[PDB]
Ligand binder design. Sequence first.
Ligand code: ZN
Lengths: 221, 382, 86, 639, 130
Amino acid sequence: IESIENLEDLKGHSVREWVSMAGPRLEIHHRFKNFLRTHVDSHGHNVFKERISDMCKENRESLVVNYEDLAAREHVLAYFLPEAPAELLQIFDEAALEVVLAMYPKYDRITNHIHVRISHLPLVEELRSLRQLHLNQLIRTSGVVTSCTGVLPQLSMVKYNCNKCNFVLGPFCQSQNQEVKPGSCPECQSAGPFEVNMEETIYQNYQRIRIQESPGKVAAG
Amino acid sequence: MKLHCEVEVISRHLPALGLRNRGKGVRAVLSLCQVRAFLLISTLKDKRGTRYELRENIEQFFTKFVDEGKATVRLKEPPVDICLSKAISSSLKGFLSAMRLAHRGCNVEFENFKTKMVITSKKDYPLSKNFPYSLEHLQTSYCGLVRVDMRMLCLKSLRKLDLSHNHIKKLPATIGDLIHLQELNLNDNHLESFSVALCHSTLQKSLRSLDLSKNKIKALPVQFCQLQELKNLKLDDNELIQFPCKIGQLINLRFLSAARNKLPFLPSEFRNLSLEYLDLFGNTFEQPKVLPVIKLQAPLTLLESSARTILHIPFHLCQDLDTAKICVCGRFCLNSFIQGTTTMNLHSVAHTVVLVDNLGGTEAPIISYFCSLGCYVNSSDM
Amino acid sequence: RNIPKLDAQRLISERGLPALRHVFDKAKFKGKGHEAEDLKMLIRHMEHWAHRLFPKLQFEDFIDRVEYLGSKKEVQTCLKRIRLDL
Amino acid sequence: NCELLATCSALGYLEGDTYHKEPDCLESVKDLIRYLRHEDETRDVRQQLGAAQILQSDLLPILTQHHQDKPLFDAVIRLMVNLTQPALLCFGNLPKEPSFRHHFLQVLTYLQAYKEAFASEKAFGVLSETLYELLQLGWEERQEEDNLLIERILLLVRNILHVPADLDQEKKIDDDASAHDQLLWAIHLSGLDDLLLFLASSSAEEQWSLHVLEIVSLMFRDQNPEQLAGVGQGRLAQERSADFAELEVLRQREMAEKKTRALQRGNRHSRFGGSYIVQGLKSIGERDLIFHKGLHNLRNYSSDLGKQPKKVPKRRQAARELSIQRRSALNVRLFLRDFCSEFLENCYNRLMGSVKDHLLREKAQQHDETYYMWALAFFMAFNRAASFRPGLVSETLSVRTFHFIEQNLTNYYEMMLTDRKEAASWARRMHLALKAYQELLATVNEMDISPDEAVRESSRIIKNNIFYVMEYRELFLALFRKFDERCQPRSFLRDLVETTHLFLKMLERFCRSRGNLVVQSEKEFNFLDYLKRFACSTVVRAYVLLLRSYQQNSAHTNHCIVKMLHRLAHDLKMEALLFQLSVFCLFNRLLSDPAAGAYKELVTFAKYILGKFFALAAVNQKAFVELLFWKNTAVVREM
Amino acid sequence: LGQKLVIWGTDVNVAACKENFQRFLQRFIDPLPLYMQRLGEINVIGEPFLNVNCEHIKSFDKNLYRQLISYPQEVIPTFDMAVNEIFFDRYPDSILEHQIQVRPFNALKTKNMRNLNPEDIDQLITISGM
DNA sequence: TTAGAGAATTGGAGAGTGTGTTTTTTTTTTTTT
DNA sequence: CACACACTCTCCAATTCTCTAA
Ligand SMILES: [Zn+2]
């Protein structure tokens, strides 16, 4: 894959498919790795060396990136980030894992994924002002948390025992949209009462919160 | 090259998207055509079948059940998945080898006939020799067949053979050469008896429904009990004066109809039945509680025939099994000849009973054995 | 079951043309200057006859089928017979 | 996919409005051409480059901003011709199975996208400028280097004009600029239209006559000659007032139909019960009919009130017209009128002579005579429209063109009947031939009307020749006796009927004016025994089939139908041929029409034949049975 | 053809019922030509309905009243046809949004809610209530 | 030139499979009692 | 559980295509 000297020329694509295809994906990956490795603050201190070191000291599995720093240092990543946030956040997580395992080669024992979190995004929105124009875009809102579920286990990559034979169905990704139905067993074609393999299934923490407008920002009555 | 089989094509988005497939295949033919190789899948829906590219783009195969039991290939591709639910193993293996070669790439009518046919009368259509060879099901009715013919006997795959309302006087022994026969009906024919040697034929393991109603049979053979696969048995409107004494061996039996026959009393092993449905209406069972008991004299032969049934080809041993007298009565066994009769409630053996007679009429007499307390109870009843 | 057909032999010469000969014995046309209502009466009678013959079809579908049936042996033989005597 | 992405990236990038080409554009473009040449039969590289939109993003900017770099320009032109290759050429045919049809639709989608992109005037300006500075040189000065470039330029223009309109965006309303209209406007502003006129009029560059003919055909694809010839300065007020008036007419028709339906149903809700016995009407059994659909329906009772219509099986489904007509943009219509006028005055005779020479020499593709016949129809119709001058089309007025069109029409007729797997395509080719024949037959009438005794003389000569030779007379009967609604559209049936009406008009007037008895080894002739050949059941069956759409037919078409049927009835005494039950149902609709006053001729003819029928029926009741079938000589037995 | 119609299982001729209601409209005058005044009021006001008193129908023709009460689902549409035929035989170019509805009514209740029975099904009744 | 006998394709009857269902009381809390 | 709806598949035979004689 040749390095792409200009990510900015979409050449008629939209941002989502443009960053989904391999060339721009690798270019974004390398640009984010270089950003993490070489970004320095106003005093010349490498901020992300310190941040990754603190994260690995405390086993926290998550890396907060300042959007102001990203926009200042690497423009096109900040350009594509709010347009295709899921795709670029996946790529950023991969790149951050590469940098983290460069710094701490044994951190795979503690984690298998690094979550890149974005802070100080200028795209601030009021809850009353969210429209269909903001769909599938990275927004920033404010409010008071009024409800919280308990921390619940959710399927992320689920495996199913076949209802008759001993085969196990392949990894199916959970989507947040609907229940994943296994289909039919490829060994024998049965499609009966399948059951989750708890030991081979990968779970993730889930918590659904309800936020509302803060009572001092809502109008009286 | 071509393969005939049931096919099911599953687009692989469906499971993760939460959508469930049909769950069974559709009869089809697969063709490996080729300047560059294609797979053509054609069904009843499309003689002009769908192509699929396979030059470089087979994902993987599944082969755990290529022996063609609960089977498939589950051939995955970008993006579809192709399942082959029933074929023949050798041709399917050759087809899979050709598919693998085509994917390596560097080198190189679903006609059918139904299970079923019917003749409502010979003068409308005779059976002739135009039947399908592997026919599964046929009805013949109101035809003048005095005896069953090779025309239906030679059929290689019959599940159902029906001759009801024909004029059969006798039926053969070679009707039992039908391996998969599960339904045999001769309702309203002229049968004098069921075929004796037919009991130990393929029907011994295969027959699940037998109908001999409206025939002048006076008695079934004692080796009729060999038909232990049988679930449904219909014998009403006949001259039948007794069941076979070893009817208790018909452990698969669930439905029994023998209404308006000549039965005086039931066999002793009738207690071993576990029917769902029993019909014996108007059979003229005997009323009295008289005690005409057969006495033993305690001979060694009777004692041996009684006792050896509990520890059992030899024809004498088979006859002794038939004359076991229910293992020489259920208690205080002496010999297999101490025979009498008592009264039985038919809900002991069937959860649905047709009221055989009036005035309650839920009971009938049954052969019994009277060692000690049984004889005492019989004396009390008399 | 006996799924019916509007064919040349079931009904077209049995409940069809022989009855159509009799349908207009009691008709009530009034001639020149009244062609519109005469045609309305004619169409109603023809439609009623066609319905009682084959009730599965609409009237124009019945017409488009029977015009094809006009080429068949039984139909034209019955037509010539009706032209001649009975 | 990724290797194509790499080369597409290597082409360069756009910045604002300026394209910065990489130095390796030449080898990357050659690699793209190599991939396209080594395509799969599914045309995967075609689909992938269309998805990447490099034609819109790279090649058009390179073509428009680096046209001085001649090797790159030539390579880009060849690549663009390859990419704009029409889908029917890409796949050979319309695929019969879903996968190849999906690939066909993908390539067609990207072709439509290319056509959308190509409306920029800059691209056609560069193409016109390079073609102009090439054609500035003498023909003898050209070599393969320049002749092949002319071929590729004209093929690029042909490919871009050929593209079908997207089914999604063909819903444009009239008087709006479709993608084709914008493309024609781009050609107009670039001045490539004048270059096409030069190429058509040039004697030296006659080698490109077939190409230029195809360009002009695809340019005038959507237009109608008389409608186009009527365009002028004062059209905006006319069309505005016409639109308002037509809106009101449509509204009044809908209001009338709504009132009739409101009367047909009652003023009570549908679950308001009530049942009646109609004592006289026997049911399908012997019992009296029980009616449940309300008393209001028994005024116009029919037994098919509640019946589902029938599925016409696939084989019997009638052919439908392939496109609706829309009034294109007024600027484009004015430009096309001016193009057609100047082309007719300056180019048409030489171009048609050149194309006929090409067809004679047999250095043309398989069906280029279809373009020839199209050009005959369109430009002779445009000539007769507005200022008719036969000198502008005198190359076409020869009897040899009549012979050529008749031969082509008979050939297409035979091939339609035999090559059944593209019978509709052969029918369309035959339709083009029929329209060309119709325009010749109309042009001789216009020559008769015109004042010049010379053109009147030659009109008499060609009329004598055509009416003498037998095939011109027999072809109409041949077409009627094997026309099929299943295969040929109602537009074809309209054109056939109108051409037959015009032909019989001319022949009748000719024979009425003078005897001219010998015809076809000659034999005698008269028009009455010729008309008796139109007394067959099949031809009148076709005529009433066209009559069924009298509501939608043009007034001239209705006049043609009713005049032919009046000729067969009143003048040949063949009313029993037209005594039919289906025809009587059509007459019932005609008499029941609320707009029956607008069809005074049709209803009067219908009442004439109905009165004759009811006279015969009063005399003899077997006429009711005779209504039920089509007939042969029972037309005389009934009499 | 309307003259062949009879109400189902009723032996009442729809055409005869229509004619009887037409002569009722034409000739009843004495509530103290009555209903032609109501037709003119409809003509000038533009309201498509006609109120008619069942007692007037009864006093004019007992049999017509019995038919109306017993078989309203057919008789009331028959009265609609009658009144519209009269109204558009007169006033030939007046335009109405809908055909006129005849609205027969009894001045007082014929039955009460407690005494309604299955014998009264598909029968015209008048009841008082809140 | 019409139409009728044999072969192939399409319409739809029906056999088989899968899904969904049948005012009351005790306690708190803020405001008003 | 079990009795109605809802949906798919298969087979059967009725219609239309092709080739021949009246
Ligand atoms: Zn399995």
